Paper text:
The asymmetric unit in the tri-pilus is three subunits, each with a different orientation of the outer Ig-like domain. The inner long-helix domain exhibited a rise of 5.27 Å and a twist of 106.8°, similar but not identical to the symmetry for the mono-pilus (4.95 Å, 104.8°). In contrast, the outer domains formed trimers, breaking the symmetry of the inner domain where every subunit was equivalent, and had three times the inner symmetry with a rise of 15.8 Å and a twist of −39.6°. The final resolution of the tri-pilus reached 3.5 Å, as judged by map:map Fourier shell correlation (FSC), map:model FSC, and d9919. However, compared to the mono-pilin, the globular domain of tri-pilins undergoes a significant conformational change. Rather than projecting out from the N-terminal helix, it pivots almost 180° and bends towards the N-terminal helix. The relative orientation of the globular domain with respect to the N-terminal helix also varies across the three different subunits, A, B, and C, in the tri-pilus asymmetric unit. These different conformations are facilitated by a flexible Gly-Gln-Gly linker region situated between the two domains, and the cryo-EM densities for this linker region are clearly seen. In contrast to the mono-pilus, where inner helices are fully shielded by outer domains, portions of the inner helices in the tri-pilus become exposed to the solvent. In the tri-pilus, the outer domains trimerize to form a closely packed left-handed trimer protofilament, with minimal interactions between different turns of the protofilament. In contrast, in tri-pilus, the hydrophobic inner helices are not perfectly enveloped by the outer domains, suggesting reduced stability compared to the mono-pilus.
Author numbering:
A (entry chain B), B (entry chain C), C (entry chain A): 13 to 143
Write the structure that this text describes.
Amino acid sequence: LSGAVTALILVIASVIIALVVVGFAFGLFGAFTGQGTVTQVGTATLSAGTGTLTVTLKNTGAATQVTGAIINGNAASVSGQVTISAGQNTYSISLGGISSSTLQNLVGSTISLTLQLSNGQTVTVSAIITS
Amino acid sequence: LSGAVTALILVIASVIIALVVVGFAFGLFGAFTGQGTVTQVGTATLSAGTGTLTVTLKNTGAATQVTGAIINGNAASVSGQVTISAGQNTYSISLGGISSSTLQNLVGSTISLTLQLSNGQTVTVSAIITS
Amino acid sequence: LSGAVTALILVIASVIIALVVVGFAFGLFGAFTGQGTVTQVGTATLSAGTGTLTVTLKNTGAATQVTGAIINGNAASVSGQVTISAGQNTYSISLGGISSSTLQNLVGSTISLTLQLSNGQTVTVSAIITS
């Protein structure tokens, strides 16, 4: 009974250390290439009714704007306030191009977007879906 | 006479907690690579007289329904309120196919079930027997 | 994770050393023939919003202005600090003729320019598309 709790604390912590090391190694690409690395902070609530995505991306480097988004393997087209200035900020990106049927069907779950930067590497956004 | 019962309750429940912990650690891999993350929140109450699960399943993905349950190596059948729509609700599932003679013996105790979702992966469910 | 980082560092260093060797060969030719050669020192920034190009051209020869530039296989027009006086300096020229949206779409990445001097020679300018 005692050995099943120390076997879960270690799993929970190992999920975290590996992710921290992975993030540190991800950052080394932007640190050496000379371009800032954009990563999201917190969670995002993509709206099925409007298509607006409310992210909180933070970047440490140049000011680069996104060009496209990938939803469930289907390409999209971004719009709205897309500049991604330096420092943490809030952006109301309105993606469009995919049929709204998937958006209204998939209400409640947390899908994983892939916003495509102009400069290079993309940023993976895990966004919940609201009504 | 007193220690022989407290050395049995602890063993029986240690099996349960170890199985639940390893089920969580196993479903973590599936939710990590490709599949969903349908897990149980809390503990369920399985009636022994009529037979009805009251599980509290939380999932973030497509709507998937269970197809069969396992109660100590015995396959069962599911019918009732079983659709599992995205979110975290309470589902009343009427289990069937099990004889009403192997459950009332251990009323007031806890067992471990195994629900078989539509998308393949199985979730370990902890249930308490109620008369 | 280590292999990818090592490959990235080696790729960047290979680019830098190849460009250095090429510049050395060009300078050798210029010294042999009698007239100096315009070689860019370091990197350059090209603002997509405005079109002004900041370059660090140097030449150990006569003062020859530049007349045209090549962007993505499309000729353009130049103006501004276009004199290119003898000695290393920091010249700021304004590109003209490129479509603003196309270059705006590529903020952050690096491209290759090709300036056209008046004497009858060209200088390759690798520029970062800032904005």
